[PDB]
Amino acid sequence: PEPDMITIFIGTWNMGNAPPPKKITSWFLSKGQGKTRDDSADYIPHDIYVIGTQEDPLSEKEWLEILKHSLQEITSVTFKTVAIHTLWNIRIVVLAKPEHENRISHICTDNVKTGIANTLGNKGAVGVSFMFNGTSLGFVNSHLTSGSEKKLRRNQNYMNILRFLALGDKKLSPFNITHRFTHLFWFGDLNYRVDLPTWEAETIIQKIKQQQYADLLSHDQLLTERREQKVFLHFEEEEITFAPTYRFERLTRDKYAYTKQKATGMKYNLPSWCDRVLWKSYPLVHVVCQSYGSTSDIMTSDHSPVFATFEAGVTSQFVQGQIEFLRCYATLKTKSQTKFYLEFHSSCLESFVKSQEGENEEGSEGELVVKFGETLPKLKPIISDPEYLLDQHILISIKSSDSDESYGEGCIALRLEATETQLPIYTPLTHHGELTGHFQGEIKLQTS
């Protein structure tokens, strides 16, 4: 009997070029500080474990042996290797329960190297994707540019990874990783810092000792850059309720090592939440964060490991019906005056469908409204069963007739309140991960 939900463990650890201690089980049990897992769940395995490392000094063979031993000790299950991929000292391991070996297909791996010349050679990202039954899953482990003064370079690294990491279905040619997966998890040493003056270091340390994180989180560069729509547009993160995970003295967690030294290039490392887990799932699909925290007992690195766990909705492929898009229009931020057409892509279609050109008019601010009227092709899904169709998504790309390049991409849920009824639909449109416009109109879904 096929599951409707699985549980996914995400771990991120910057190992600080040191080997791990003998026992790392606390990481995989979600024990320590923050939103932690209940003791009563300790022996219950997660379906999929995704382990991201940075500054990893081990061989693939050495680290795989440690991970499989740790999980065997916790669960009495011998986990199967789905994928492993390493770029320099940045690594991703995906392990799954053996009962899932025939549920997992289309495994892909890739990496991106960020920067150019002297910034090219240790920062970037690794990724894995696969299908679990009918559900596509993507996982990204990035190690972004270091240093409190380099937030804009981190945002540029993000944009490069999002654009160039080649995962998921290659037929989705208009779409980047932010639209190719039912569920996308993006984690790593993202290296965003708490932006307070360097002379406040001792004040920050006393706030951490009091477990008073609010005045530090209000200066966390990732939270402020996300609020300003500069990075991770349309991603989610669980609330942080654990101490900063960087930068610790090794072999204890009692001291933060913040002061400038020759070894840090005379940079301050004020305590920061460098180590993060974010996600982006298709609209209305079940995804719940069940833990988000840091370990307290793993002390070989200047970072503490971070864990996050999720309940994630999955579907079967189910191996007459109709989707009608009515009175639709795109509002674009572009100054271009080409004509545009749409492509509709979905796992529920045999192949993507191209629309005729829309009718351009000038909007209120002078910006571009592209009108599609009642002109859009009726989409014919391969299965009409409402238990299948209402769980599906239509990916939309708006493309230039002159260049055939996408100006914007979005996603529409078929999880409607009604069938055979005209209902409002809406997605933002993004391109290279930044907002380019909006798509709005009405839908009518025919099922059996």
mmCIF file of all heavy atoms in Angstrom, residues 5 40 62 102 110 115 126 143 204 236 262 306 334 348 433:
data_model
loop_
_atom_site.group_PDB
_atom_site.id
_atom_site.type_symbol
_atom_site.label_atom_id
_atom_site.label_comp_id
_atom_site.label_asym_id
_atom_site.label_seq_id
_atom_site.Cartn_x
_atom_site.Cartn_y
_atom_site.Cartn_z
ATOM 1 N N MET A 5 2.043 10.369 2.323
ATOM 2 C CA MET A 5 2.944 11.308 3.027
ATOM 3 C C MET A 5 4.197 10.529 3.346
ATOM 4 O O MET A 5 4.106 9.307 3.691
ATOM 5 C CB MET A 5 2.324 11.813 4.338
ATOM 6 C CG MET A 5 1.667 13.194 4.219
ATOM 7 S SD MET A 5 0.915 13.713 5.794
ATOM 8 C CE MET A 5 -0.656 14.328 5.176
ATOM 9 N N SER A 40 9.707 9.909 22.068
ATOM 10 C CA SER A 40 8.855 8.734 21.702
ATOM 11 C C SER A 40 8.996 8.368 20.213
ATOM 12 O O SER A 40 8.568 7.277 19.798
ATOM 13 C CB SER A 40 7.423 8.998 22.056
ATOM 14 O OG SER A 40 6.885 10.027 21.244
ATOM 15 N N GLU A 62 34.253 6.888 3.394
ATOM 16 C CA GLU A 62 34.395 7.073 4.851
ATOM 17 C C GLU A 62 33.092 7.676 5.400
ATOM 18 O O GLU A 62 32.614 7.244 6.459
ATOM 19 C CB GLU A 62 35.570 7.977 5.171
ATOM 20 C CG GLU A 62 36.905 7.303 4.976
ATOM 21 C CD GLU A 62 38.081 8.278 5.082
ATOM 22 O OE1 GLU A 62 37.963 9.545 4.819
ATOM 23 O OE2 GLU A 62 39.212 7.746 5.310
ATOM 24 N N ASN A 102 12.111 0.707 -5.094
ATOM 25 C CA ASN A 102 11.330 0.621 -6.363
ATOM 26 C C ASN A 102 10.376 1.820 -6.497
ATOM 27 O O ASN A 102 9.733 1.907 -7.523
ATOM 28 C CB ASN A 102 10.656 -0.748 -6.570
ATOM 29 C CG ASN A 102 11.276 -1.531 -7.712
ATOM 30 O OD1 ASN A 102 12.504 -1.673 -7.770
ATOM 31 N ND2 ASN A 102 10.447 -2.006 -8.640
ATOM 32 N N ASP A 110 24.039 17.268 -9.851
ATOM 33 C CA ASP A 110 24.705 18.368 -10.556
ATOM 34 C C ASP A 110 25.414 19.253 -9.541
ATOM 35 O O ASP A 110 25.202 19.120 -8.274
ATOM 36 C CB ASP A 110 23.784 19.199 -11.433
ATOM 37 C CG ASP A 110 24.507 20.037 -12.493
ATOM 38 O OD1 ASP A 110 25.673 19.684 -12.884
ATOM 39 O OD2 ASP A 110 23.933 21.126 -12.865
ATOM 40 N N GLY A 115 31.292 32.404 -8.610
ATOM 41 C CA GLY A 115 32.413 33.368 -8.699
ATOM 42 C C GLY A 115 33.205 33.224 -9.992
ATOM 43 O O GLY A 115 32.821 32.414 -10.869
ATOM 44 N N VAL A 126 25.959 21.761 -4.606
ATOM 45 C CA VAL A 126 25.666 20.413 -5.145
ATOM 46 C C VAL A 126 24.189 20.163 -4.999
ATOM 47 O O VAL A 126 23.562 20.711 -4.071
ATOM 48 C CB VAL A 126 26.513 19.324 -4.483
ATOM 49 C CG1 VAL A 126 27.978 19.539 -4.754
ATOM 50 C CG2 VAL A 126 26.281 19.273 -2.992
ATOM 51 N N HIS A 143 27.282 26.238 -0.283
ATOM 52 C CA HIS A 143 28.251 26.938 0.568
ATOM 53 C C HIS A 143 28.501 28.285 -0.083
ATOM 54 O O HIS A 143 29.088 28.330 -1.181
ATOM 55 C CB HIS A 143 29.537 26.130 0.685
ATOM 56 C CG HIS A 143 30.425 26.593 1.764
ATOM 57 N ND1 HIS A 143 31.676 26.051 2.005
ATOM 58 C CD2 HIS A 143 30.249 27.549 2.691
ATOM 59 C CE1 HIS A 143 32.219 26.634 3.030
ATOM 60 N NE2 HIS A 143 31.365 27.561 3.516
ATOM 61 N N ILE A 204 26.166 40.700 22.406
ATOM 62 C CA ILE A 204 25.528 39.581 21.661
ATOM 63 C C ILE A 204 25.698 38.285 22.444
ATOM 64 O O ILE A 204 24.751 37.535 22.595
ATOM 65 C CB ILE A 204 26.140 39.498 20.243
ATOM 66 C CG1 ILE A 204 25.737 40.733 19.449
ATOM 67 C CG2 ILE A 204 25.755 38.212 19.549
ATOM 68 C CD1 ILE A 204 26.576 40.954 18.188
ATOM 69 N N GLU A 236 10.136 29.271 2.133
ATOM 70 C CA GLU A 236 9.730 29.237 3.553
ATOM 71 C C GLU A 236 10.947 28.845 4.398
ATOM 72 O O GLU A 236 11.885 28.142 3.933
ATOM 73 C CB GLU A 236 8.632 28.201 3.770
ATOM 74 C CG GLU A 236 7.423 28.375 2.870
ATOM 75 C CD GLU A 236 6.641 29.653 3.041
ATOM 76 O OE1 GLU A 236 6.709 30.297 4.149
ATOM 77 O OE2 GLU A 236 5.958 30.035 2.030
ATOM 78 N N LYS A 262 44.847 36.653 12.403
ATOM 79 C CA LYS A 262 45.492 36.423 11.084
ATOM 80 C C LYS A 262 44.761 35.293 10.361
ATOM 81 O O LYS A 262 44.474 35.438 9.155
ATOM 82 C CB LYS A 262 46.971 36.064 11.241
ATOM 83 C CG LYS A 262 47.875 37.252 11.501
ATOM 84 C CD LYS A 262 49.351 36.867 11.457
ATOM 85 C CE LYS A 262 49.883 36.517 12.825
ATOM 86 N NZ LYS A 262 51.339 36.780 12.919
ATOM 87 N N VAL A 306 22.987 21.440 12.005
ATOM 88 C CA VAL A 306 21.581 21.836 11.944
ATOM 89 C C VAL A 306 20.744 20.702 11.372
ATOM 90 O O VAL A 306 21.151 20.077 10.385
ATOM 91 C CB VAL A 306 21.373 23.188 11.236
ATOM 92 C CG1 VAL A 306 19.941 23.493 10.878
ATOM 93 C CG2 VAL A 306 21.959 24.317 12.038
ATOM 94 N N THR A 334 8.483 43.980 -17.751
ATOM 95 C CA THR A 334 9.304 44.230 -18.985
ATOM 96 C C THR A 334 8.949 45.515 -19.742
ATOM 97 O O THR A 334 7.759 45.849 -19.865
ATOM 98 C CB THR A 334 9.156 43.125 -20.040
ATOM 99 O OG1 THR A 334 10.187 43.359 -21.001
ATOM 100 C CG2 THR A 334 7.826 43.098 -20.767
ATOM 101 N N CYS A 348 0.827 15.878 -15.747
ATOM 102 C CA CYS A 348 -0.488 15.275 -16.112
ATOM 103 C C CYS A 348 -0.769 15.417 -17.614
ATOM 104 O O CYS A 348 -1.848 14.931 -18.051
ATOM 105 C CB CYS A 348 -1.672 15.810 -15.325
ATOM 106 S SG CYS A 348 -2.232 17.478 -15.751
ATOM 107 N N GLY A 433 14.672 33.701 -10.838
ATOM 108 C CA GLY A 433 14.365 33.709 -9.391
ATOM 109 C C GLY A 433 13.892 35.066 -8.888
ATOM 110 O O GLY A 433 13.716 35.172 -7.664
#
